[PDB]
């Protein structure tokens, strides 16, 4: 029926240094996300004083491949912080659908079958 929002998360990992310090490393984000607006929102979350542990908010070398790194001190429960990311931050995405069709002017709505059905009969008329 083409309606509803679904949950989406970023490829995000905890990585250990040569010192044993942990690092939140993201690779990408879901659809319609800025690096920089979320980065400003991270700097907010720093000055909003509603999240702890976070030390380094860094991003470099991104043109050979996207690399944004948050780095957090020890004794902080970093996976709980990842849970707090995908609760409150915009890194979590509630991506909604709406596919309300139009077939010859009048508005309609289709299943995935019916789309391909109209495609089939169009190809019929095309090749004929």
């Amino acid at each position: 029926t083409g309606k509803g929002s679904i949950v989406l998360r970023s490829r995000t990992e905890i990585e250990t240094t040569k010192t044993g310090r942990e690092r939140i490393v993201v690779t990408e984000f879901p659809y319609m996300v800025n690096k920089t607006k979320v980065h400003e929102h991270i700097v907010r979350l720093v000055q909003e004083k509603r999240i702890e542990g976070i030390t380094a908010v860094r991003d470099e070398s991104n043109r050979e491949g996207v690399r944004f790194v948050i780095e957090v001190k020890r004794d902080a429960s970093a996976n709980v912080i990842l849970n707090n990311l995908f609760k409150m931050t915009q890194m979590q995405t509630n991506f909604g659908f709406n596919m309300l069709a139009i077939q010859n002017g009048i508005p309609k709505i289709l299943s995935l079958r019916q789309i391909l059905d109209a495609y089939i009969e169009h190809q019929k008329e095309v090749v004929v």
């Binding site: 240094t17 010192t19 310090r21 030390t55 380094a56 780095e71 001190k73």
Partner: protein
Amino acid sequence: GNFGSMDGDSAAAQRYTEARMSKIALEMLRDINKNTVDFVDNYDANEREPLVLPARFPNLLVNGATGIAVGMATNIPPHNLGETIDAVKLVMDNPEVTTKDLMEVLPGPDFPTGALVMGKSGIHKAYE
């Protein structure tokens, strides 16, 4: 390299001097490999450092202090190696020592140069 004396000497040759580890430092700072001292991370989040050190003598007494007056400065006079050892042995053997005991195992504070200290009760009020 150039270091001068108590003369008014200015050795501007900075890296041109030679130095490395000293003999007293060798046994003075062992036991790092024995988890003896705690550590903190730098601001650079890459390497650690200890806030205190392990000791093989109270260098407090071996080298004095010439402070600055952030609230007030501090003079602390130097002393002797074996006299400090005998003081350690004295306090070890007796938890009931006196200040005359300190007069015995420390006849007086000394210098790398030498002077004359004629007073007695000033020394008494100094150590008390």
